[PDB]
Design an enzyme around this catalytic site. Structure first.
Site, PDB file in Angstrom:
ATOM      1  N   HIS A   1      48.092  -9.465   6.003  1.00 35.98           N
ATOM      2  CA  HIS A   1      47.504  -8.328   6.694  1.00 35.98           C
ATOM      3  C   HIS A   1      46.160  -7.965   6.042  1.00 35.98           C
ATOM      4  O   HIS A   1      46.113  -7.458   4.916  1.00 35.98           O
ATOM      5  CB  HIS A   1      48.452  -7.124   6.742  1.00 35.98           C
ATOM      6  CG  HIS A   1      47.959  -6.037   7.638  1.00 35.98           C
ATOM      7  ND1 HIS A   1      48.062  -6.138   9.017  1.00 35.98           N
ATOM      8  CD2 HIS A   1      47.315  -4.889   7.333  1.00 35.98           C
ATOM      9  CE1 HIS A   1      47.522  -5.033   9.499  1.00 35.98           C
ATOM     10  NE2 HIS A   1      47.081  -4.241   8.526  1.00 35.98           N
ATOM     11  N   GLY A   2      45.081  -8.288   6.751  1.00 35.46           N
ATOM     12  CA  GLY A   2      43.722  -8.001   6.329  1.00 35.46           C
ATOM     13  C   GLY A   2      43.348  -6.682   6.942  1.00 35.46           C
ATOM     14  O   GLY A   2      43.844  -6.344   8.025  1.00 35.46           O
ATOM     15  N   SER A   3      42.532  -5.891   6.219  1.00 38.61           N
ATOM     16  CA  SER A   3      42.040  -4.572   6.651  1.00 38.61           C
ATOM     17  C   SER A   3      40.823  -4.200   5.804  1.00 38.61           C
ATOM     18  O   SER A   3      40.671  -4.751   4.701  1.00 38.61           O
ATOM     19  CB  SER A   3      43.135  -3.511   6.540  1.00 38.61           C
ATOM     20  OG  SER A   3      42.819  -2.320   7.244  1.00 38.61           O
TER      21      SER A   3
ATOM     22  N   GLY B   1      44.577   4.914   2.536  1.00 37.12           N
ATOM     23  CA  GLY B   1      45.434   5.380   3.617  1.00 37.12           C
ATOM     24  C   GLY B   1      46.639   4.480   3.809  1.00 37.12           C
ATOM     25  O   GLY B   1      47.749   4.981   4.019  1.00 37.12           O
TER      26      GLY B   1
ATOM     27  N   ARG C   1      50.794   1.670   9.831  1.00 33.63           N
ATOM     28  CA  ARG C   1      51.098   2.512  10.995  1.00 33.63           C
ATOM     29  C   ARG C   1      50.711   1.874  12.334  1.00 33.63           C
ATOM     30  O   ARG C   1      49.927   0.922  12.379  1.00 33.63           O
ATOM     31  CB  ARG C   1      50.384   3.875  10.834  1.00 33.63           C
ATOM     32  CG  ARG C   1      50.997   4.733   9.711  1.00 33.63           C
ATOM     33  CD  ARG C   1      49.991   5.551   8.935  1.00 33.63           C
ATOM     34  NE  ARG C   1      49.097   4.716   8.134  1.00 33.63           N
ATOM     35  CZ  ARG C   1      47.769   4.816   8.131  1.00 33.63           C
ATOM     36  NH1 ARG C   1      47.162   5.751   8.861  1.00 33.63           N
ATOM     37  NH2 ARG C   1      47.040   3.992   7.392  1.00 33.63           N
TER      38      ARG C   1
ATOM     39  N   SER D   1      43.742 -13.031   8.681  1.00 27.30           N
ATOM     40  CA  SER D   1      43.843 -11.652   8.194  1.00 27.30           C
ATOM     41  C   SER D   1      42.606 -11.292   7.388  1.00 27.30           C
ATOM     42  O   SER D   1      41.982 -10.269   7.686  1.00 27.30           O
ATOM     43  CB  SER D   1      45.104 -11.462   7.369  1.00 27.30           C
ATOM     44  OG  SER D   1      46.252 -11.628   8.177  1.00 27.30           O
TER      45      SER D   1
ATOM     46  N   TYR E   1      39.583  -9.588   8.915  1.00 30.69           N
ATOM     47  CA  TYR E   1      39.637  -8.159   9.192  1.00 30.69           C
ATOM     48  C   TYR E   1      39.202  -7.316   7.960  1.00 30.69           C
ATOM     49  O   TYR E   1      39.288  -6.084   8.030  1.00 30.69           O
ATOM     50  CB  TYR E   1      41.042  -7.771   9.695  1.00 30.69           C
ATOM     51  CG  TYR E   1      41.367  -8.389  11.034  1.00 30.69           C
ATOM     52  CD1 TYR E   1      40.836  -7.869  12.213  1.00 30.69           C
ATOM     53  CD2 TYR E   1      42.144  -9.540  11.124  1.00 30.69           C
ATOM     54  CE1 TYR E   1      41.099  -8.455  13.450  1.00 30.69           C
ATOM     55  CE2 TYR E   1      42.442 -10.116  12.362  1.00 30.69           C
ATOM     56  CZ  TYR E   1      41.913  -9.568  13.524  1.00 30.69           C
ATOM     57  OH  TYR E   1      42.163 -10.137  14.755  1.00 30.69           O
TER      58      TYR E   1
ATOM     59  N   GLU F   1      50.599 -15.090  15.326  1.00 23.40           N
ATOM     60  CA  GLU F   1      50.534 -13.688  14.930  1.00 23.40           C
ATOM     61  C   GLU F   1      51.898 -13.065  15.167  1.00 23.40           C
ATOM     62  O   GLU F   1      52.662 -13.554  15.997  1.00 23.40           O
ATOM     63  CB  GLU F   1      49.381 -12.887  15.564  1.00 23.40           C
ATOM     64  CG  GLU F   1      49.366 -12.748  17.070  1.00 23.40           C
ATOM     65  CD  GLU F   1      48.048 -12.183  17.549  1.00 23.40           C
ATOM     66  OE1 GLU F   1      48.050 -11.086  18.149  1.00 23.40           O
ATOM     67  OE2 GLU F   1      47.001 -12.816  17.290  1.00 23.40           O
TER      68      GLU F   1
HETATM   69  C1  LIG Z   1      43.959  -4.935  12.003  1.00 26.78           C
HETATM   70  C2  LIG Z   1      44.587  -6.313  11.902  1.00 26.78           C
HETATM   71  N1  LIG Z   1      44.875  -6.989  13.045  1.00 26.78           N
HETATM   72  C3  LIG Z   1      45.395  -8.244  13.008  1.00 26.78           C
HETATM   73  C4  LIG Z   1      45.659  -8.917  14.196  1.00 26.78           C
HETATM   74  C5  LIG Z   1      46.194 -10.177  14.166  1.00 26.78           C
HETATM   75  C6  LIG Z   1      46.484 -10.750  12.937  1.00 26.78           C
HETATM   76  C7  LIG Z   1      46.239 -10.134  11.710  1.00 26.78           C
HETATM   77  C8  LIG Z   1      45.682  -8.866  11.763  1.00 26.78           C
HETATM   78  C9  LIG Z   1      45.407  -8.177  10.607  1.00 26.78           C
HETATM   79  O1  LIG Z   1      45.644  -8.723   9.550  1.00 26.78           O
HETATM   80  N2  LIG Z   1      44.851  -6.903  10.661  1.00 26.78           N
END
Ligand SMILES: Cc1nc2ccccc2c(=O)[nH]1
Length: 348
Positions: free
Chosen positions: A200-202, A209, A216, A242, A245, A326
């Site tokens: 999970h990349g952000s 947060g 969330r 990921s 992102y 995904e």
């Molecule tokens: C924000 C977010 N969206 C994704 C959509 C598909 C695969 C991975 C991601 C993710 O890591 N972050």
């Protein structure tokens, strides 16, 4: 003072008010009319409902002015600065996706800036110690020569996609995280089968947060855009998918990524865009079937949890609108964040 340098390095990094300001400016927000301190939940909540009102109007086929009214209303609520360039009308999917992308960041930017001003910030206690407590998360450095460290470094190395040939991922720090109450919340899904360690990349400005309130799902007011399978939590088995992102620039190649225990269960495996939020009977998740998958033959069971760290191989699926797999869950209790990684991006 009393925290390990990498743990400290991470706090100052996620709690940087200057980094928060950078993002606002990058969204062309007027920081004179809309400073970091003016941003409120009900204001962003209002901004979502307008986008949902915009996507409904465009769908229902509205008139130039009534569609223009919502564009003015949105900008009147979230002051933007475009300089001499004319304000872009929010009347298309690209226009709403880009504003909806911004609110997600602004939501987690508020949740973070609120934390900073919140608390009895006095003087004697080190800013780091004060802020790290406010995350309500046990952040512990994973040792370089540990078992998990080799697994996590194998995962990063092998699941970097051939398509994502614009950077080389370099691991700096691995943190074994455990969010306050998350295991108590996750407890009903711990028994479930098909539990996987996924990516999970952000953006960095969202992690204060993400560790504060967890991963969330979009609120009901949010427009239903950007995501292929509705409002849920999205993961990848490919690190670089990921890692994309993180939105790491050549000037700022430092970003953070996650590894969460996602209790997938019986997956509703789809191939093309399909909004649901309401799954089918017996299904616990959605799996976006990608053309490329990590070698299923090269799976590892790290802590009785499936780790698809296999080298990139092509799956026998070709009738799909997805490049890489995904995974989506529509219950925040099905996620349990295990690691936080500090990654260097080496642009070619
Ligand atoms: C924000 C977010 N969206 C994704 C959509 C598909 C695969 C991975 C991601 C993710 O890591 N972050």
């Amino acid at each position: 003072s009393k925290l390990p340098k990498p743990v400290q390095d991470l706090i100052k990094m996620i709690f940087d008010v200057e980094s928060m300001k950078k993002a606002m400016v990058e969204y062309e927000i007027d920081l004179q009319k809309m400073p970091l301190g003016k941003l409120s939940k009900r204001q962003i909540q209002a901004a979502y409902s307008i986008l949902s009102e915009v996507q409904q109007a465009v769908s229902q086929g509205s008139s130039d002015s009534q569609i223009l009214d919502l564009s003015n209303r949105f900008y009147t609520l979230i002051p933007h600065d475009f300089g001499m360039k004319k304000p872009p009308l929010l009347n298309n999917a690209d226009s709403v996706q880009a504003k909806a992308e911004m609110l997600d960041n602004l939501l987690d930017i508020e949740v973070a800036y609120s934390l900073l001003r919140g608390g009895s910030d006095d003087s004697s206690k080190d800013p780091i110690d004060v802020n790290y407590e406010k995350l309500k998360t046990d952040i512990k450095v994973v040792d370089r020569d540990s078992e998990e460290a080799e697994i996590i470094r194998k995962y990063v190395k092998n699941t970097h996609a051939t398509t994502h040939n614009a950077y080389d991922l370099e691991v700096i720090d691995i943190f074994k995280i455990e969010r306050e109450g998350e295991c108590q919340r996750y407890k009903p899904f711990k028994q479930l089968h098909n539990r996987r360690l996924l990516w999970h990349g952000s953006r960095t400005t969202n992690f204060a947060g993400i560790l504060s309130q967890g991963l969330r799902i979009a609120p009901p007011e949010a427009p239903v855009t950007g995501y292929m399978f509705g409002k849920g939590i999205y993961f990848a088995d490919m690190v670089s998918k990921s890692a994309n992102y993180c939105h790491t620039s050549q000037g700022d190649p430092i970003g953070l990524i996650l590894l969460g225990e996602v209790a997938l269960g019986n997956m509703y495996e789809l191939k093309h865009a399909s909004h649901i939020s309401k799954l089918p009977k017996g299904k616990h998740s959605v799996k976006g079937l990608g053309k490329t998958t990590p070698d299923p033959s090269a799976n590892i069971s790290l802590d009785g949890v499936d780790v698809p760290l296999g080298t990139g191989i092509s799956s026998g699926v070709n009738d799909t609108s997805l490049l890489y797999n995904e995974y989506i869950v529509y219950d925040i209790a099905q996620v349990n964040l295990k690691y936080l990684l500090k990654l260097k991006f080496n642009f070619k």
